[PDB]
Amino acid sequence: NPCCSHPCQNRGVCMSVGFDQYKCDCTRTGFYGENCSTPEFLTRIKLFLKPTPNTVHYILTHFKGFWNVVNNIPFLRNAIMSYVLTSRSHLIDSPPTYNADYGYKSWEAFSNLSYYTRALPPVPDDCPTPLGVKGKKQLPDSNEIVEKLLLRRKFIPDPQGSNMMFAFFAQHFTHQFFKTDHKRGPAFTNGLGHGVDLNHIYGETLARQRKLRLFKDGKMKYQIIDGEMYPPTVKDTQAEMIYPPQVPEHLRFAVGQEVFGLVPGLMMYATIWLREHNRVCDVLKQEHPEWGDEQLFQTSRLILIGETIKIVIEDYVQHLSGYHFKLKFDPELLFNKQFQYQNRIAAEFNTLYHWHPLLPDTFQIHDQKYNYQQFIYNNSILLEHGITQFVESFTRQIAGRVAGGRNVPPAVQKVSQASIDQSRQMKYQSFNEYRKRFMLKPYESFEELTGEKEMSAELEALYGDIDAVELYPALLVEKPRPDAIFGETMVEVGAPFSLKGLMGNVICSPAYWKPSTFGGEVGFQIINTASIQSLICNNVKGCPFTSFSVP
Amino acid sequence: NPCCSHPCQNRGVCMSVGFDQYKCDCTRTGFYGENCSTPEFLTRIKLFLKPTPNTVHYILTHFKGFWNVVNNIPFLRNAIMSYVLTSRSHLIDSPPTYNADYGYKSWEAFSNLSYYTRALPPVPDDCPTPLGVKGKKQLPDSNEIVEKLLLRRKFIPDPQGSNMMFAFFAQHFTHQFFKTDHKRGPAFTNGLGHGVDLNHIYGETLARQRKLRLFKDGKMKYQIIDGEMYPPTVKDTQAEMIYPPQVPEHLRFAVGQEVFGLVPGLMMYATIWLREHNRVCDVLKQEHPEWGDEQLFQTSRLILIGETIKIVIEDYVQHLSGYHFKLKFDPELLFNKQFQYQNRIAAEFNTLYHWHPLLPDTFQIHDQKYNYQQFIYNNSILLEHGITQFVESFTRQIAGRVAGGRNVPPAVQKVSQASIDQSRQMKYQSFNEYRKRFMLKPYESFEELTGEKEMSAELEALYGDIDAVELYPALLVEKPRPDAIFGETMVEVGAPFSLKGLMGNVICSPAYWKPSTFGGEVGFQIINTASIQSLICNNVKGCPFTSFSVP
């Protein structure tokens, strides 16, 4: 297969022509030639003027005084934010194209929502090497890579100051659209909403939703334990959950996502968001004493969706980016732009989001420490301390650095191995191919990748060729930005996926984005004034201080 | 419920506040005020310069010499076609909003693909009248509406000269996205693709597709009978069809759409498209001897989707419109425009497409006449005469006029009544509410509507108030355009749904509209040179002349 070498540059589409030849489709690439590598004139001007992402990053993370001014000039701030959204979004094909089973456009690949979609097509089945033509005939042993490059010896804290509130928010939020269907395989998902539909609160199916709802005042079922609201049980709802046999029945909390009983940190956010829904129901009832249970429920969900997108953009990504420029959730920024209000979750987005180096060696709640053996699947811990103590504790506890290598806790070691193995089962192209796909220069050496001599040597001994290095391992050992949680590739590849999932949500479309959609101005304002602090403040006893970084 | 009166004008959203008050959301409507009735400064100017659709239609259906020149000036033709697409599309909400069960925006209504979507929300339940406030407490008897207004007395042929090739193409083509799920209710569909996916050729599910495919050379299973290609049998495929018990095994033809055994006219087009699929397979195999069965099949399907959209726009709609301006299928026209590449089938689009007055009193194949008892479920007629004769016969037979009233054949009289009854089940707003929704002046009397005295008198006797006339009956009794098949409302309501379904298709998006998507320039050219004539010419023996109008 002549396309095995990935001849076509700059998004050119490769097509076999006979058995020994290929043809590159250069349509609207800005290039031409046999391999789409010759630039047209305006492309040359664009490339000459375009600053490197590391330069843009430097500028956005320095000159605080300058950004303080920009931030307070709405006209400028809006123009910048608008540019951030459209420029990054252009990197995503929407409607989607490839999946694990199709390296060419097909109706199956487009129409079948059970697949994760693909930013780069799978490597053809009949290639001389598993990645195309580069690297050895067999990839390095999964376990070797994990042990040599990814396994944590000494905990490395995040220099950006990310805390456990950030880590569990990341896990909680993303697990509404990262829902791998392992019955089928890693290529498939159970999140057919393909974005931020809050199914991890309300359930994927209507049947599950009905089990969780109270059908009074639009609210969700709950328990009152030690004076506070908690989610209901499997018994009361009949909504299935993943729990080991050890967990007693009355501790088997039931929420939207079946897996959120895994850790108390997830059950914390599930608890918090449950309280928010029922709180919003109270608000809306005051506004609409004439509304039935149905409209109260639905309208609350639309509000909580807006709250989610609001918080993610202006607190989560804000913290995550390190930018002094103040990000803004404002759908109106895009109303005069070309933009597709739809999304399909990319498998590569799932892969890059395996941020298990965030996880600590032990979890500190109040004044007690828990190892993984006793923290996992233990909801009594949650009842023992209550939500307030959890927020105060997690806000103070530092998370680990994601990039930089050797920071995956031994407890979730096999998870890292599974993330590598599943990439290969899904025929991912190389790390350098994904760099080029997102307009980054490919790395020329292993030492260039890590910015260091030790790991780069293990990399060379394992891979031999820099173009044979795989996506997921490379992301975690890549040289971090200066005092940053991530390296260049994580950000430039991840950001476009993220923004498409956030702004591509239906509520951001002009027909939806208006007061009447959310029950009037009061409801509309709950979205537009939402923050991670106000979320905690409204639903957590005592209204503790919280933030995505440690004080 | 104060919103029962539909107080909010110009796409403003009505919302109840307390038990006795309403609110109008005027956001981006171009109007303000209590009922969104007062135009903004810009809106005044636009309104003053906007010509009436009847004027636009006059211009487009006159000045033949002028349009002949415009059609040959690519610059002008493109600009005009571009405007047609963009202007008509702004009238559809995309992503979709309401459905039968939700007259307010909700995630259930957006996300649940099993519903037909709604252009206007359902009349709320506890309303003074079925339509809102207008009309009597009880709607007129539906069978009385049919006999008095819709039932054919003498056959009225279409002045635009539409033939049976047109009639059966309309039925065949639209029945891929009009797939009402009657075991669930009129408000639901089985066509989850919600557009032009050719599921009526390939099957809705992968399981059905697999029964119909040959899994050799990308082809679909088939029979050779009398030296000609026909669809395979139910026995050979195990693909379920709807056939009454009398139909013998060997005449039970199996195709994508379960119901296409209903009439030989449908099965005619099913046969022609099946032939086209396997013809394209042969073309692609020549272009790509290295390709496997799967890629050959998928690429053919995408080409046939391209052919379908091409033919619908440039032959079907072309004839339908009566326009002298030459409509163009060209996705490139929208690449610099705002446009959503997605669609959701509207229940109202389904309703307005019940063009059963098209049907003749008898079906004349060759020198034979067939009544409905003889013609329906009778594929023996298809084998007896063959496809060539069917084309020759349907091309020469005239269809009936749709607007103007009293032209529904007695044979499908109950289908007409079903349309009315089912629309009442789904709680459609009045005919005049739908006029306003698509920027038409509401009719001030029954005479203005029908442009006639008998039926207008019949309508007032049944409805009393012109604002109480229902959607479906009004569409059929409406004053046609001069020597036109349709009245104003059918066109101005229908065209947006149609274009949105056609151009909203994924293959029209810039990522897809590439020769590489369709196997190269040859495959690409099949799409861009397709016509109803070339479809027949390529797959019908003798290459008979055909057209959507009678000679």
Ligand code: COH
């Ligand atoms: C982004 C942050 C994040 C965090 C903080 C986090 C924190 C934790 C955590 C906290 C104590 C524990 C016990 C685990 C344990 C697991 N996680 Co993560 N996970 C995270 C992102 C993910 C993602 C994404 C997946 C796979 C998604 C999928 O396909 O279901 C995942 C998968 C897993 C799996 C199964 C992977 C497989 O079978 O292939 C286990 C087990 N994990 N994780």
Ligand code: COH
């Ligand atoms: C647009 C042209 C068109 C034509 C030419 C046509 C020609 C014919 C025809 C020719 C001999 C016959 C016997 C019928 C008979 C029927 N049609 Co039409 N139909 C057409 C458009 C439709 C549409 C649209 C529907 C409803 C779609 C749905 O929901 O399935 C329909 C529905 C029906 C139904 C189901 C009604 C119900 O279940 O309540 C029957 C039966 N019919 N039709």
Ligand SMILES: *[C@@H]1O[C@H](CO)[C@@H](O[C@@H]2O[C@H](CO)[C@@H](O[C@H]3O[C@H](CO)[C@@H](O)[C@H](O)[C@@H]3O)[C@H](O)[C@H]2NC(C)=O)[C@H](O)[C@H]1NC(C)=O
């Ligand atoms: C899209 O909306 C459909 C209509 O609401 C919905 O179908 C409904 O699904 C529910 C639950 O799946 C069915 O519930 C009935 O059956 C259960 C079975 O145990 C019983 O508890 C009750 O008898 C209950 O009434 C509804 O019957 C069904 N309604 C219809 C008209 O089909 C779909 O599930 C929705 N689609 C998605 C993807 O959520």
Ligand SMILES: *[C@@H]1O[C@H](CO)[C@@H](O[C@@H]2O[C@H](CO)[C@@H](O[C@H]3O[C@H](CO)[C@@H](O)[C@H](O)[C@@H]3O)[C@H](O)[C@H]2NC(C)=O)[C@H](O)[C@H]1NC(C)=O
């Ligand atoms: C989206 O793609 C999925 C993967 O191809 C597909 O799942 C596949 O569906 C087929 C057809 O139902 C299954 O067929 C197998 O099961 C039947 C059951 O009787 C048996 O005859 C055979 O053993 C047959 O192999 C596949 O097993 C199944 N594959 C997987 C991995 O789940 C979905 O159906 C597609 N979605 C849609 C809407 O079409």
Ligand SMILES: *[C@@H]1O[C@H](CO)[C@@H](O[C@@H]2O[C@H](CO)[C@@H](O)[C@H](O)[C@H]2NC(C)=O)[C@H](O)[C@H]1NC(C)=O
């Ligand atoms: C789950 O966490 C709880 C903490 O709330 C653990 O329960 C404590 O166990 C110690 C020693 O067994 C007792 O002295 C405490 O009184 C317990 N606390 C409560 C509130 O009952 C429990 O051991 C943990 N479960 C696992 C499997 O580690």
Ligand SMILES: *[C@@H]1O[C@H](CO)[C@@H](O[C@@H]2O[C@H](CO)[C@@H](O)[C@H](O)[C@H]2NC(C)=O)[C@H](O)[C@H]1NC(C)=O
């Ligand atoms: C279905 O169509 C066939 C014709 O294709 C009808 O069969 C004909 O019936 C007449 C009178 O009954 C005979 O004189 C012909 O010899 C038959 N021709 C063939 C080819 O069978 C048949 O009657 C039709 N079915 C119905 C129910 O009317």
Ligand SMILES: Cc1c(Cl)cccc1Nc1ccccc1C(=O)O
């Ligand atoms: C969006 C964005 C900007 Cl603008 C800058 C910097 C980062 C992001 N985002 C992300 C980047 C990488 C991985 C995940 C994300 C995420 O948002 O979830």
Ligand SMILES: Cc1c(Cl)cccc1Nc1ccccc1C(=O)O
């Ligand atoms: C699109 C269009 C134009 Cl531009 C003019 C005139 C007619 C149409 N179309 C339609 C109008 C009414 C009902 C159906 C259709 C259809 O196309 O199926």
Ligand SMILES: *[C@@H]1O[C@H](CO)[C@@H](O)[C@H](O)[C@H]1NC(C)=O
């Ligand atoms: C395109 O790439 C191929 C490698 O497959 C190379 O042999 C050829 O010289 C390249 N063509 C150009 C114009 O760079």
